[PDB]
UniProtKB/Swiss-Prot annotation, chain A:
Protein's name according to its UniProt entry: DNA (cytosine-5)-methyltransferase 3A
Region (Interaction with the PRC2/EED-EZH2 complex) residue spans: 21-113
Domain (SAM-dependent MTase C5-type): residue spans on this chain: 161-427
Active site per UniProt: 237
Portion of the parent chain present: 474 to 912 of 912
Task performed by this protein: Required for genome-wide de novo methylation and is essential for the establishment of DNA methylation patterns during development. DNA methylation is coordinated with methylation of histones. It modifies DNA in a non-processive manner and also methylates non-CpG sites. May preferentially methylate DNA linker between 2 nucleosomal cores and is inhibited by histone H1. Plays a role in paternal and maternal imprinting. Required for methylation of most imprinted loci in germ cells. Acts as a transcriptional corepressor for ZBTB18.
Amino acid sequence: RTRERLVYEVRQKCRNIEDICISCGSLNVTLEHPLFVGGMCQNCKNCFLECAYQYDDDGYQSYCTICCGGREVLMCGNNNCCRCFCVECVDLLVGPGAAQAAIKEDPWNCYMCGHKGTYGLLRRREDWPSRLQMFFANNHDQEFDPPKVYPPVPAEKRKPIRVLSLFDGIATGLLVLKDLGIQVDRYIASEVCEDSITVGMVRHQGKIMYVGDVRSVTQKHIQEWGPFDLVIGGSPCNDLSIVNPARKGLYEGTGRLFFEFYRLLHDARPKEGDDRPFFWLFENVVAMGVSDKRDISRFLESNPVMIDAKEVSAAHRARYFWGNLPGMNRPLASTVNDKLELQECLEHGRIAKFSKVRTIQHFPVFMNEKEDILWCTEMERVFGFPVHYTDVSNMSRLARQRLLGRSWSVPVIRHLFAPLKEYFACV
Amino acid sequence: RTRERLVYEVRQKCRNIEDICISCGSLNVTLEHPLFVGGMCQNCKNCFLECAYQYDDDGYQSYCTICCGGREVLMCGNNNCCRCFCVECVDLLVGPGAAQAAIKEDPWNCYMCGHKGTYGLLRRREDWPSRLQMFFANNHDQEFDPPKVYPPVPAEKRKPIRVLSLFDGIATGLLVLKDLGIQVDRYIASEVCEDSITVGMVRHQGKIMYVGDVRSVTQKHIQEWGPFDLVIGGSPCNDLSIVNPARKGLYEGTGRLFFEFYRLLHDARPKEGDDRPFFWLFENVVAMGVSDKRDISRFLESNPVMIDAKEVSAAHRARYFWGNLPGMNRPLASTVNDKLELQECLEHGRIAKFSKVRTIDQHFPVFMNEKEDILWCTEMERVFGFPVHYTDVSNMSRLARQRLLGRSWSVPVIRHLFAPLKEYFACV
Ligand SMILES: Nc1ncnc2c1ncn2[C@@H]1O[C@H](CSCC[C@H](N)C(=O)O)[C@@H](O)[C@H]1O
Ligand SMILES: Nc1ncnc2c1ncn2[C@@H]1O[C@H](CSCC[C@H](N)C(=O)O)[C@@H](O)[C@H]1O
Ligand SMILES: [Zn+2]
Ligand SMILES: [Zn+2]
Ligand SMILES: [Zn+2]
Ligand SMILES: [Zn+2]
Ligand SMILES: [Zn+2]
Ligand SMILES: [Zn+2]
């Protein structure tokens, strides 16, 4: 209402659109809106951090793109686009009679996909992917000191790495370390789900010393299992995401388990004065709470780096990485082995309409004039796992897909773990 | 139903009552029931930990005493007794025709207060307060190593104590340290509520250095504010208790703030090899979750000690204390200054119906001039062992000031806990 009055005042050329927050009509303009023209208040920044990468079961966005709220949204008909524009924002930026006439338009493209690009009150700002990448470096509200850079040990003095992996899953971290050719002295890995235990047991040939519950693990265990050189882990993102229909809480269950990672990180950290190279990685999903993200950034004492897997793989897997691994910030490079098109990951006899899959038009494959799910071995190919990685035991397809989806993106974790070759021995 | 068939088999003398779990009828009998005769399964132990000290707005118990569940409970008419027995348990242990006839009895006592104390299928075990005290030493499910005992520093080498207090409130901890006569070098205190800030500012004469929110305190702040010798804290129990009608969550809000205490504890802890005496106390309420209590015990790496203030003061203020303060286990001694009766804590011209008041239709506890009346604010200060007129600082309402008093630690309990710190730090 106040939004709409302010945009009415703007169309008279009495107020600049860049001096007003186009999301909620707030005068407290600190930022500029990254995609479109207007200002941006800080409450709308927190709402934009929480809500922008939230998608319904549909596959399309949970809320509007402009204000991250709205009442009734307008879904885009363009292929591979999932954006939604609520009716209240289109009443402003396009006009109060053009939303109703644009609903009647059956092939309707949204304004991020509009072939023309320019409109009367709304124009699309040009370097919007660059500003979307800079928008997460814009999160300087949590200001910290940079992670301590340790000087590289000489190549003759390097030793095999020792990894404490919490929330191991299907042993993605050890698989990536072997893919880099780093010698692994030992790989301690706590995990509870039997199927993921079994995947790692078979695929890594009994090298992994499997552990009980993380909460059961104490500091004495951490001391007696040798000094650790790399401590990795990722919080469960089954309840933390908006994709699960059963969102009874947000940081019941999953948050607890984060604090378990926090405690065993301190337990594995060498003392001050012990200048031996130690490293740690935490992972979480982007569709998360702001105060959640703050509390995580404060406890781990570090700024999160967002890394989307689209730059290197065929999925849309945007994940926050806290850590002190050198070159965590540096831009991602996709090797020729990595498949950037979904069609390359498909089996033979199958053709994909999509170029990317949003796993967080339900079934993404046209085969034999019929709509079908990605097969399990294809999902393995999509994240960059080796072929037939999860065919170990006699488990169902629904469970095995669910076992694959939770996992870290393999070229992303390769990109992250790659400078550790400078610090430890090679095969 | 099954448990009712089980009790039927017990009254035929085919099964012992001590081989069955009288709460829910489970055959997995690990423990014995502490108050009455029968076994006790572990799930019922967890339900007993959570539910036993939960009281309604009535003042009486939230659930049945026997099974911690039940459907419709029977409240006890005896004075100062707040127990409830659900109809389904009395169908067994007294008989299926005696519950109905015992409702009709208008002066009805319960079976922990029964003059006879010996009924047909239900008898009362004799050393039940001893077994209630031992029942919290029976919580060895969370087994840990004992807290490290540091050897005492000589009396000529002692220095004034430095306290980092989180969730200070009305500065109970510094007041108790001054009551003991310990020299305090500095008292940093984080606190958000203005009224509790103000109480501390006036009652402790600007000595307290006040911080903003606990979530704004970094490790850099902990390093630059001097080494700390004693870190204390207590989580909010407004939402965590069952007394608040608005229980939307359990460890939303309050749970966070616990971890803030956890982090700043690690930030204030000296390194390994730095053998200087460092101490810490955390406090929480007893009407809490089991897995909650587990997670807290695991993070703080210690076994809780339940301490009820009834042993030293006029309230029932049963609280868990985690810590490494020496003699945290040892039994409580009530000095002659402490008032064990409620009547002594009353003003003149007022006479109490109760001997103890616990506040987390006899809702108002005082019979004055043929009329029922709340405890006055200065009396609530006397009940917890605060000095007289402790909270009369600023122009604040009575409801707010009572609410400001009720959250606070019990002063002779905290005196009992802090007392061996005199052996480690300087005196006035
Ligand atoms: N208490 C607990 N201890 C260990 N693992 C747990 C756990 N609770 C859940 N998990 C498991 O931890 C995972 C959360 S996220 C797993 C991602 C992992 N990096 C991978 O690539 O597979 C799930 O597999 C979940 O089943
Ligand atoms: N984030 C926060 N930082 C500091 N204090 C807080 C807080 N949230 C709540 N509090 C306060 O902490 C107290 C919780 S319990 C206070 C008991 C205290 N030992 C005493 O004797 O007063 C309440 O006074 C509450 O208002
Ligand atoms: Zn706004
Ligand atoms: Zn909108
Ligand atoms: Zn579009
Ligand atoms: Zn039972
Ligand atoms: Zn009962
Ligand atoms: Zn009674």
